[PDB]
């Protein structure tokens, strides 16, 4: 019967954890138990035993300012404040970070660290970040916020561009990164040592940077999340191609803008950018192209190891040494997007941070989700940001607010959204929407929630969709159903020759997946590919087990069927960059030309059928630009690559069609269930319960549209019958060769009869009947 741990939970409650309380009495414990302050004895008011949980609840006048208390029994233990108690005493509502005045002559600087003994700012040269220029102690307020005003006293007349860190004493000096840092010094993770473990923050004034007429998107037809066609692009990928060697630097915001007309023409409404906030593992001074085909040890990074939640990465800047440049550059890009009638969605990664020490150094036992002993819960050798905790929630909501208001960002995609409490994300949305009425938010709603050990909460995951109409979630059900997904990637599915229950395909096309309840189409982000896992092309190739050279058109015919189904489904439409042309993550490396042993290459999947270079990367976060570059020749050079450019034009046409009628962008489940019909019922003609062909009717507000998809490897008769024979009076606008809104006078891959259609194998047909 020994004292293990101790936590003060409120003004008059200390919780002492023991190994056991069996056979010991309230009277025997009151005897041995004694409480002490910062050495004096505190009057012990009462104890209550929780024998089950093996802990005493101790009552007394345990006023915080009489230091932490330490509990005696037999060994002693100093009490720690619980995160709920730290919120009670130290939750701060005011401005955080460092704020420049108009002429840069002063800075107002705040940092939250309620258990710090002292907090010194260390200031480094703007023209050389390694050189220490000045230091200043900060003054702690009532709520544990450390403040200072930088001015003439430190010998600097203009602070803009100067860098800073915070040395924090506890007992232990540790140097930390202002979590509200608005920009940073050029960052190279190879400079990390024991003393400085992070990027240095930077004195900048966002409001004075970039286009001062920046404003939110002006998207036509856009009346909600259902009207969104999202396009997921990585800033490096989009311009890392060698063929672009004919204005702005490689793989930067300024480069990205030069290829916006493409996306304007492609028809997408929103460009979703992979994490543009600062991430840890990089050398931002090395912009050189990696030309070798590899899946490890590349300066390339998707950006899923977060360093800052407010400060942009230098990697996408032309001038990474100028901390103001990022902000002006990203604003320039976002402005350029808005002029093209489109919007931005920023991928944001709050679920975890690059290194636990990033926030744990600032204030131990607070920012992260925790185990019952105070130990921080971790993910990826990184900290799990516990966003039920007030100041952790602030980091998320304030950054959302800041990015929304300062960069005129139109939406956000939350990585591993199910790691967070619903409440944090709901507030995030509410605040972001308050700034921008047209705010759109999506996220990965995988049921992954961990939280604080013994404290369950509603997570921001798929099951949350019942009880909000705010944030939408990726539909892995439609993904898995159409062409397989993690963990069982490669399994033949609807467009890869494996028969699927047509009722569940039809329900998915209505934005009603089988694995969670979507009571509004806007709850569902429909997708078949993303940056994660194999690309659409590669998964198709693997699933049908064929070589991409020989089966190219077989694979592309199947790929176009996937895009047709996503782009004519209800809910929010999502397109992975390259999915439009047939992008591949082929491992064209000599040492991997044929299968190898046990000893596999990193993050690669094998296709047997293929002889030459059989390895394809399914997790390209650490892969070269050779693996990760968007192929512009494949996407726009009709002459050189007729098959991929056909798939591209086809995908464009489908987007055009989707935007041109609200038959595919309905608002409620009520009207979807009424106006979206299943033409191919089980039994009608050749149709089995599980099958590889399906067709459905929709109606906009009164043009009827009918989408037919034969994913079978043979031709198939679709029986219209009494109910749908009226379709024959309409006209074809999508066929084997082309997609759009104009009628096709000589359609291919389909034949019409008195009351039926004979559709070619691996072919999609769409008919319009205006009225
Ligand atoms: O970070 C790990 C992976 O996270 C993502 O995978 C998701 C899947 O996309 C999602 O379908 C879900 O898969 C589980 C599935 O729903 C469940 O029924 C099955 O029994 O277990 C599956 C676990 O694989 O959740 C996972 C993550 O938990 C992401 O797609 C992938 O890239 C990541 O590697
Ligand atoms: Ca177009
Ligand atoms: Ca500089
Ligand atoms: Ca809902
Ligand atoms: Ca890397
Ligand atoms: Cl893809």
Taking CA atoms only, the protein residue closest to ligand 1 atom 21 is 487
Distance 476 CA to ligand 1 centre (A): 8
Are 165 and 172 within 8 A, CB to CB? no
Catalytic residue among 415, 538, 631, 735: 415
Q: How far apart are CA 533 and CA 490, in angstroms?
A: 11
> Is the separation of the CB atoms in 143 and 92 below 8 Å?
yes
**CA torsion sign, 424 to 430 to 431 to 432?**
positive
- The tokens for 424 are 């944090």
- For residue 164, the CA-to-ligand 3 centroid distance in Å is 12
**Candidates 232, 406, 444, 662; catalytic one:** 444
**Beta partners for residue 370, in sequence order:** 376
Is 446 touching ligand 1 by the criterion CB < 6 Å?
Answer: yes
Return d(Cα 380, Cα 419) in angstroms, integer.
13
444: annotated active-site residue: yes
User: Cβ distance 603 to 538 under 8 Å?
Assistant: no
Half-sphere exposure of 53 (CA within 13 A, CB side): 12
| 453 neighbors 374 (Cβ within 8 angstroms) | no
Q: How far apart are CA 529 and CA 267, in angstroms?
A: 18
Cα distance between residue 149 and residue 136, in whole Å:
9
- What's the CA gap between 20 and 476, in Å, rounded? 46
End-to-end Cα, the chain, rounded Å: 83
Cβ–ligand 1 distance for 532 under 6 Å, the answer yes
Contacts 24+ apart (CB under 8 A), 482-485: 482/528, 482/562, 482/565, 482/566, 483/528, 483/536, 483/539, 483/540, 483/543, 483/562, 484/539, 484/543, 485/533
In testing the pocket of ligand 1, which one of 379, 486, 487, 516 has its CB within 8 Å of the most ligand atoms?
A: 486
Q: Which is it for strands 756-759 and 440-443: parallel, antiparallel or unpaired?
A: unpaired
Query: From the CA of 619, how far away is ligand 6's center (Å)?
Result: 13
* Of residues 559, 607, 560, 558, the one with CA closest to residue 713: 558
Please check whether residue 231 is in contact with residue 617, taking contact to mean a CB–CB distance below 8 angstroms. Answer: no
Q: Is 178 helix (H, G, I), strand (E, B) or coil?
A: coil
Helix (H) or strand (E) holding 4: strand 3-10
Helix (H, G, I), strand (E, B) or coil at 326: helix
d(CA 414, CA 149): 35
DSSP state of 13: E
Under DSSP, is residue 214 helix (H, G, I), strand (E, B) or coil? coil
Q: Fold match between 205-676 and 677-771?
A: no
- One DSSP character per residue, 681-715 reads -TTSTT--SEESEEEEEEE----EEEEEEE-SSS-
> CA dist 147 to 49, 114, 171, 199, 374, Å?
42, 12, 21, 21, 27
Task: Please report, for residues 536, 693, 709, 720, 751, the alpha-carbon distance to residue 713 in angstroms, rounded to integers and kept in the order given.
Answer: 19, 10, 12, 21, 17
CA distance 557 to 761: 9
What's phi and psi for 155, nearest 5 deg? Answer: 85, 5
CB 257 within 8 A of CB 297: no
Between the CA of 562 and the centroid of ligand 6 the distance, in Å, is 11
CA 113 – CA 501 distance, rounded (Å): 56
Give the containing element (helix H, strand E) for 174: strand 174-176
> Is the C-beta atom of 448 inside 6 A of ligand 1?
yes
- Cβ atoms 52, 3 nearer than 8 A: no
Within 10 A of 190 (CB to CB), how many other CB atoms are there? 10
φ and ψ of 424, to 5 deg: -60, -45
On whether the CB atoms of residues 565 and 559 are closer than 8 A, the answer is no
Please name which of 481, 474, 648, 626 lies closest in space to residue 577, comparing C-alpha atoms: 648
Rounded Cα distance, 116 and 171, in Å = 9
HEC string of 621-641 equals HHCCHHHHCCCHHHHHCCCCC
Is the separation of the CB atoms in 737 and 676 below 8 Å? no
Contact 679, 697 (CB under 8 A): yes
Cα 237 to ligand 5 centre (Å): 14
Question: Which ligand is nearest to the Cα of residue 533, counting in written order?
Answer: 1
Is residue 476 within 8 A of residue 485, CB to CB? The reply is yes
Contact predicate 159/99, CB 8 Å: no
- Cα(14)–Cα(9) distance, integer angstroms: 6
Q: What are phi and psi of 293, to 5 degrees?
A: -85, 105
Cα–Cα separations (whole angstroms), residue 394 to 308, 398, 471, 714, 771? 14, 5, 19, 57, 53
160-162-167 Cα angle (round to 5): 130
Residue 128 Cα, ligand 3 centroid: separation in angstroms? 7
Name residues whose C-beta falls within 8 Å of residue 128's C-beta, 6 or more positions apart in sequence: none
Give the separation between CA 480 and CA 489, rounded to whole angstroms.
8
- Edge-to-edge strand list for the sheet holding 716-719: 716-719, 756-759, 750-752
Count Cβ atoms below 10 Å from residue 590 Cβ, excluding itself: 8
CA angle 609, 610, 613 (to 5 degrees): 150
Nearest to 185 by CA among 196, 166, 201: 201
Ligand 6 centre to CA of 626 (Å) is 16
Resolution of this deposited model, Å = 2.4
Count of CB atoms situated within 10 Å of the CB of 702 = 8
Ligand 5 center from residue 592 Cα (angstroms): 21
Residue 236 and residue 276 in contact, taking contact as beta carbons nearer than 8 Å:
no
Q: Please identify which residue in the block is written with the tokens 């999508």.
A: 734
Nearest atom of ligand 1 to the alpha carbon of 487: 24
Q: How far apart are CA 650 and CA 655, in angstroms?
A: 9
Burial-class residue 564 by CB neighbours within 10 Å (0-12, 13-18, 19+): buried
Q: Is the CB of 752 under 6 A from ligand 1?
A: no
Q: How far apart are CA 77 and CA 69, in angstroms?
A: 8
Question: Residue 15 in 3-state DSSP?
Answer: strand
Q: What's the CA dihedral at 617, 620, 623, 625 to 10 degrees?
A: 100
Q: Which long-range contacts (CB under 8 A, 24 or more apart) does 369-373 make?
A: 369/450, 369/451, 369/452, 370/83, 370/452, 370/453, 371/453, 372/17, 372/453, 372/454, 373/5, 373/17
If one counts every other C-beta atom within 10 angstroms of the C-beta of residue 438, the result is: 16
* Deposited experimental method: X-ray
Distance, CA 168 to ligand 5 centroid (Å)? 30
Catalytic residue at 415? Answer: yes
Cα 640 to Cα 643: distance, rounded to the nearest angstrom: 9
Ligand 1 atom closest to 476 (CA):
11
- Ligand nearest the Cα atom of residue 584: 6
CA angle 16, 21, 25 (to 5 degrees): 105
Q: Which ligand is nearest to the CA of 299?
A: 5
A 10 A CB-CB count for 446 gives: 17
Chain breaks in the chain (C to N over 2.5 A) after: 38, 74, 171, 246, 597, 701
Which residues crowd ion ligand 2, with CB under 5 Å? 267, 656
**Residue 135 C-alpha from the chain's centroid:** 37
Q: What's the CATH class of domain 1-92? A: mainly beta
Q: Are 309 and 399 in contact (CB under 8 A)?
A: yes
Going across the sheet that includes 13-18, the strands are 46-50, 55-59, 13-18, 3-10, 80-81
Specify the CATH superfamily of domain 205-676: Glycosidases (3.20.20.80)
DSSP characters for 496-519?
Answer: TT--EEHHHHHHHHTT--TTS--S
Ligand nearest to the CA of 341: 2
DSSP state of 412: E
> Is the bond preceding 129 in cis, omega lying within 30 degrees of 0?
no
CATH of domain 93-204: 2.60.40.10
Locate 744 and state its tokens.
Answer: 């096709």
Q: Which atom of ligand 1 is nearest to the CA of 446?
A: 25
Select from 2.40.30.10, 2.60.40.420, 3.40.50.2020, 2.60.40.1180 the CATH code of 677-771: 2.60.40.1180
Dihedral angle over CA of 570, 572, 578, 580, nearest 10: 30
Kindly report the protein residue whose alpha carbon is nearest to atom 30 of ligand 1. 486
Q: Which one of the ligands is nearest to 534 CA?
A: 6
DSSP code, position 199: P
Cα distance between residue 84 and residue 450, in whole Å: 18
Which residues are registered as beta bridge partners of 147?
A: 110, 139
The neighbouring-strand residues paired with 202 are 163
Please indicate whether residue 486, judged by its CB atom, sits closer than 6 Å to ligand 1.
Answer: yes
CB 718, CB 695: distance < 8 Å: yes
Quickly count: other Cβ atoms within 10 Å of residue 597's Cβ: 5
Ligand 1 pocket: which of 417, 443, 487 to mutate (most atoms <8 Å of CB)?
A: 487
Q: Are 417 and 347 in contact (CB under 8 A)?
A: no
615 alpha carbon to ligand 5 midpoint, in Å?
20
249 is written with which tokens?
A: 């630097």
Nearest CA residue ID for atom 19, ligand 1 = 487
- 332 sits in which H/E element: helix 323-339
Look up residue 669 and give its DSSP letter.
Answer: H
Distance CA 237, CA 347 (A): 15
Task: Please work out whether the CB of residue 450 comes within 6 Å of at least one atom of ligand 1.
Answer: no
Atom 27 of ligand 1, residue of closest alpha carbon? 446
Residue found under tokens 């489908």: 654
| Gap from CA of 306 to ligand 5 centroid (Å) | 13
Which ligand number lies closest to the CA of residue 603? 1
Q: What residues have CB less than 8 Å from 714, skipping those under 6 apart?
A: 761
* Closest Cα to atom 18 of ligand 1: 515
Dist. CA 331–CA 257, nearest whole Å? 11
List all residues 6 or more positions away from 279 whose beta carbon is below 8 Å from its beta carbon. 301, 303, 304, 305, 306, 307, 313, 354
Beta bridge partners of 139: 147
Rounded distance, CA 553 to CA 647, Å?
10
Cβ atoms of 386 and 83 within 8 Å: the answer is yes
CB distance 579 to 529 below 8 Å: yes
Ligand 1 atom 25, closest CA: 446
Question: Which atom of ligand 1 lies nearest, measured to the CA of 533?
Answer: 32
Mutation test residue for ligand 1: of 379, 413, 446, the one with most atoms within 8 Å of CB: 446
Distance CA 766, CA 384 (A): 47
Decide: helix, strand or coil at residue 109: strand
Return the H-helix or E-strand segment holding 604. strand 604-606
Cα 478–chain centre separation: 19
C-beta separation of 510 from 517 below 8 A: no
| Residue of the CA atom closest to atom 11 of ligand 1 | 476
Q: What are the DSSP E strand ranges found in 371-501?
A: 411-414, 440-443, 471-475, 500-501
User: CB–CB of 175/122 below 8 Å?
Assistant: yes
d(CA 302, CA 764): 34
Q: Is 380 in the pocket of ligand 1 (CB under 6 A)?
A: no
Ligand 1, atom 22, lies closest to the CA of: 487
> Hey, where are the domains in the chain?
1-92, 93-204, 205-676, 677-771
| Long-range contacts of residues 371-376, Cβ cutoff 8 Å, at least 24 apart | 371/453, 372/17, 372/453, 372/454, 373/5, 373/17, 374/5, 374/7, 374/80
At 706, list the tokens. 């009918």
Q: What is the DSSP letter of 486?
A: T
- Pick left, alpha or beta for residue 303 (phi over 0 → left; psi -120 to 50 → alpha; otherwise beta): left
Q: Find residue 586's DSSP bridge partners.
A: 616
Query: What is the C-alpha radius of gyration for the chain, rounded to an integer number of angstroms?
Result: 29
């Amino acid at each position: 019967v020994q004292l293990k741990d101790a936590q003060q939970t409120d003004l008059t409650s200390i919780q002492a954890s023991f190994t056991t309380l069996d056979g010991v009495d309230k009277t025997e414990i009151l005897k041995e138990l004694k409480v002490t302050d910062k050495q004096n004895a505190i009057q012990i008011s009462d104890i209550t035993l929780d024998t089950s949980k093996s802990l005493l609840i101790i009552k007394g006048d345990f006023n915080p300012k009489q230091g932490h208390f330490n509990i005696s029994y037999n060994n002693n233990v100093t009490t720690r404040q619980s995160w709920e108690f730290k919120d009670q005493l130290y939750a701060y509502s005011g401005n955080l970070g460092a704020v420049l005045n108009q002429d840069g002559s002063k800075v107002e600087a705040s940092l939250w660290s309620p258990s710090a003994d002292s907090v010194t700012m260390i200031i480094y040269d703007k023209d050389n970040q390694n050189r220490v220029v000045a230091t200043t102690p900060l003054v702690k307020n009532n709520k544990g916020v450390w403040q200072t005003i930088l001015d003439t006293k430190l010998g600097i007349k203009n602070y803009t561009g100067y860098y800073y860190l915070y040395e924090i004493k506890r007992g232990d000096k540790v140097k930390i990164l202002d979590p509200y840092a608005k920009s940073l010094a050029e960052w190279d993770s190879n400079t990390v040592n024991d003393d400085i473990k992070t990027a240095k923050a930077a004195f900048v004034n966002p409001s004075q940077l970039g286009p001062q007429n920046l404003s939110f998107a002006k998207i036509a037809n856009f009346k909600g999340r259902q009207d969104a066609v999202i396009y997921e692009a990585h800033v490096r990928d989009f311009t890392s191609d060698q063929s672009l060697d004919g204005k702005n630097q490689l793989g930067t915001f300024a480069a990205f803008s030069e290829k916006l007309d493409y996306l304007q023409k492609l028809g997408v409404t929103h460009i979703q950018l992979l994490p543009v906030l600062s991430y840890f593992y990089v050398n931002e001074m090395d912009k050189s192209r990696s030309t070798a085909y590899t899946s490890s040890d590349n300066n390339y990074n998707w950006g899923y190891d977060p360093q800052s939640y407010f400060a942009l990465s230098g990697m996408y800047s032309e001038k990474p040494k100028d901390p103001s440049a990022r902000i002006a550059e990203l604003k320039q890009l976002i402005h350029d997007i808005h002029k093209r009638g489109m919007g931005v969605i920023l991928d944001v990664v709050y679920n975890h941070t690059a290194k636990t020490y990033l926030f744990e150094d600032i204030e131990p036992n607070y920012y992260h989700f925790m185990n019952e002993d105070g130990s921080p819960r971790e993910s990826f050798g990184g900290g799990r940001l516990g966003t039920t905790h007030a100041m952790s929630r602030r980091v998320l909501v304030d950054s959302i607010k800041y990015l929304t208001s300062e960069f005129k960002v139109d939406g956000f995609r939350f990585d591993m959204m199910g790691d967070h409490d619903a409440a944090a994300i709901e507030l995030a949305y509410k605040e972001a929407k308050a700034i921008n009425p047209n705010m759109i938010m999506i996220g990965e709603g995988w049921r992954t929630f961990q939280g604080d050990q013994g404290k369950p909460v509603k997570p921001a995951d798929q099951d949350w969709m019942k009880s909000t109409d705010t944030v939408g979630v990726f539909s892995d059900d439609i993904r898995n159903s159409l062409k397989s997904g993690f963990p069982n990637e490669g399994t033949p599915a609807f467009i890869t020759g494996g028969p699927q229950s047509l009722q569940g395909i039809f329900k998915n096309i209505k934005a009603q997946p089988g694995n969670f309840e979507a009571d509004s189409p806007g709850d569902v982000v429909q997708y078949i590919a993303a940056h994660d896992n194999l690309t659409l092309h590669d998964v198709i190739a693997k699933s049908i087990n064929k070589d991409p050279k020989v089966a190219e058109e077989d694979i592309h015919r199947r790929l176009r069927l996937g895009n047709v189904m996503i782009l004519t489904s209800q809910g929010t439409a999502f397109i992975h960059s390259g999915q439009e042309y047939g992008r591949t993550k082929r491992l064209l490396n000599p040492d991997y030309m044929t299968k190898v042993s046990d000893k596999l290459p990193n993050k690669a999947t094998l296709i047997e059928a293929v002889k030459e270079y059989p390895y394809f990367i399914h997790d390209s976060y650490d892969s070269s630009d050779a693996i990760n570059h968007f192929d512009w020749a494949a996407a726009t050079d009709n002459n050189k690559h007729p098959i991929s450019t056909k798939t591209q034009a086809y995908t464009a046409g489908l987007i055009t069609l989707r935007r041109s009628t609200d038959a595919f962008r309905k608002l409620s489940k009520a009207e979807i269930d009424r106006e979206v019909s299943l033409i191919t019922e089980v039994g009608q003609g050749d149709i089995k319960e599980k099958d590889l062909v399906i067709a459905y009717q929709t109606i906009d507000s009164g043009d009827i549209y009918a989408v037919f998809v034969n994913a079978d490897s043979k031709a198939r008769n679709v029986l219209l019958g009494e109910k749908y024979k009226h379709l024959l009076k309409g006209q074809v606008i999508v066929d084997a060769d082309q997609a759009g809104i104009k009628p096709i006078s000589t359609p291919r891959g389909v034949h019409f009869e008195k009351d039926s259609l004979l559709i070619d194998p691996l072919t999609a047909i769409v008919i319009k009947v205006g009225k």
